[PDB]
Amino acid sequence: GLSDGEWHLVLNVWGKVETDLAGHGQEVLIRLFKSHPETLEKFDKFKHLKSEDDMRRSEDLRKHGNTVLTALGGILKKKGHHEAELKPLAQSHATKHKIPIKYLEFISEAIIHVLHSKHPAEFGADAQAAMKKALELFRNDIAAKYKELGFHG
């Protein structure tokens, strides 16, 4: 399974493709948003904006991009337990920016494709796989947390 090697690989590749903090975060955020405008909606953060250029290269956007980029770092690293202070994020989302269904799947997917494309020319099939699979893992964890000791019912 996934294992050490796999994990490392994914992690590194990610890290490499990512490298560009600001850009990285912003791009991801924008896509997600335009991808799943549901995102736009949830965002009370920014919404005066809602167009091509606006998302393309927006102040706030970029700002969030970094935070986004940065955070994931941990989750994947632990290369055993992205549970750094991942709980924190989880709680956060639970309360405000909930893990709205497919939302995360989308995020994950988009991020995946984005990266590979950006700083290839890995795509290394095996690599692509983990990457996506990795996001999957993350997602599963967060939700379990949420439902079972976050709110749930």
| Residues of this chain that bind ligand HEM (CB under 6 A) | 39, 42-43, 45, 67-68, 71-72, 89, 92, 96-97, 103, 107
Q: Which is nearer to ligand HEM, 5 or 101 (CB)?
A: 101
Q: Which is nearer to ligand HEM, 5 or 70 (CB)?
A: 70
Least distance to ligand HEM, CB of residue 35, Å: 10
Q: Which is nearer to ligand HEM, 84 or 129 (CB)?
A: 84
* Residue reference for tokens 């904006």: 49
Burial environment of residue 41 by CB neighbours within 10 A (0 to 12, 13 to 18, 19 or more): exposed
Distance CA 77, CA 11 (A): 7
Least distance to ligand HEM, CB of residue 19, Å: 17
Distance CA 7, CA 9 (A): 5
Residues 6+ apart with CB under 8 A from 119: 16, 17, 18, 19
Least distance to ligand HEM, CB of residue 121, Å: 25
Binding residues: 64, 93
